Amino acid sequence: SSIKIECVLPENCRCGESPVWEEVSNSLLFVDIPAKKVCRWDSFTKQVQRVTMDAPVSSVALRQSGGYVATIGTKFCALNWKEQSAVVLATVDNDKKNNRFNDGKVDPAGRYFAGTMAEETAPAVLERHQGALYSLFPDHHVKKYFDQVDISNGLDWSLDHKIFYYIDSLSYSVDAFDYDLQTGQISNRRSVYKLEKEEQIPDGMCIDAEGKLWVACYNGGRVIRLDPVTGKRLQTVKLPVDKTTSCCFGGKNYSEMYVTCARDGMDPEGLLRQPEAGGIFKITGLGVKGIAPYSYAG
Numbered sequence: 692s693s694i695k696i697e698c699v700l701p702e703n704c705r706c707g708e709s710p711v712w713e714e715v716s717n718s719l720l721f722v723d724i725p726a727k728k729v730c731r732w733d734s735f736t737k738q739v740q741r742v743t744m745d746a747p748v749s750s751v752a753l754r755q756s757g758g759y760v761a762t763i764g765t766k767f768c769a770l771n772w773k774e775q776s777a778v779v780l781a782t783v784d785n786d787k788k789n790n791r792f793n794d795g796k797v798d799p800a801g802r803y804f805a806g807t808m809a810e811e812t813a814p815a816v817l818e819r820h821q822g823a824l825y826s827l828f829p830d831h832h833v834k835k836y837f838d839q840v841d842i843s844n845g846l847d848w849s850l851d852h853k854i855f856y857y858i859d860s861l862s863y864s865v866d867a868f869d870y871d872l873q874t875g876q877i878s879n880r881r882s883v884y885k886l887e888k889e890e891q892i893p894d895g896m897c898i899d900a901e902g903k904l905w906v907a908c909y910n911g912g913r914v915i916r917l918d919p920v921t922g923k924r925l926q927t928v929k930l931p932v933d934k935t936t937s938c939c940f941g942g943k944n945y946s947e948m949y950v951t952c953a954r955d956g957m958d959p960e961g962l963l964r965q966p967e968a969g970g971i972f973k974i975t976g977l978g979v980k981g982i983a984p985y986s987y988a989g
């Protein structure tokens with residue numbers, strides 16, 4: 692049977708990112724990186740709250756003790772939603788001229804993974820290999836996993852908590868590492884899927900309840916479903932906008948997919964071809980469920 696696609700919020704984000712489903716409020720959290728906004732859309736009332744920060748905010752996540760955590764500039768921060776406040780928990784890449792965090796997600800043991808990159812001086816030009824992947828442990832200690840990253844993007848973990856999947860966008864590949872739940876350690880990087888030319892630039896990524904990976908293709912106007920064990924693409928889902936950035940599952944028992952995208956870098960023309968660009972899209976009828984997001988344990 693067929694899927695259905697709806698722009699549930701035509702937010703016109705410059706670069707909508709980091710969609711996270713908050714089931715306790717039935718809301719979708721997301722960011723708009725250059726507007727420095729963290730946003731929350733209530734799926735029932737249709738209302739959106741936005742809090743404005745003081746630097747680019749590249750990701751947001753749940754925090755078990757209350758409120759949220761976020762990556763703002765090169766800083767791991769705690770976000771007081773009620774007070775619109777951010778306290779710095781830790782900082783990385785102090786030695787970089789101009790890096791910022793990019794994509795981030797909480798692991799199955801409550802560690803906040805997030806990687807960095809150089810800040811695009813120009814869409815889309817950026818210093819090479821200036822990023823690294825980090826994780827914020829519950830005890831506020833930061834681990835550095837590897838560097839030489841171009842653009843740290845999509846990431847998630849296998850359902851048996853033994854594999855970590857990772858996208859550095861300029862590798863045009865989805866990679867895998869062995870992963871240890873008890874220590875947060877990873878090793879033995881190998882490629883699991885190299886994108887075809889029409890799939891363009893791999894961006895955000897999430898896993899589903901069957902263990903398959905869904906990857907947002909920036910400029911490919913699609914998300915693709917991948918089987919990491921066989922290495923084959925299972926399915927392609929095309930969207931009305933080209934600059935699809937990330938994806939997550941949400942709605943009742945995680946049966947719907949939410950997709951973010953970007954308006955930045957669009958020409959006057961494409962804007963008339965894609966007026967919904969930068970919006971939040973919902974996809975129903977996939978027949979697969981995702982899994983709940985994890986919450987930072989510090």
Ligand SMILES: OC[C@H]1OC[C@H](O)[C@@H](O)[C@@H]1O
Nearest residue numbers: 708793794811894895936
């Ligand atoms: O141009 C950089 C941007 O490209 C789109 C990515 O989804 C976003 O995370 C990144 O910051």
Ligand SMILES: OC[C@H]1OC[C@H](O)[C@@H](O)[C@@H]1O
Nearest residue numbers: 900944945980981982983
């Ligand atoms: O009903 C909630 C459940 O929906 C199915 C998801 O796979 C699971 O992670 C989630 O906890």
Ligand SMILES: [Ca+2]
Nearest residue numbers: 794844894895
């Ligand atoms: Ca991204």
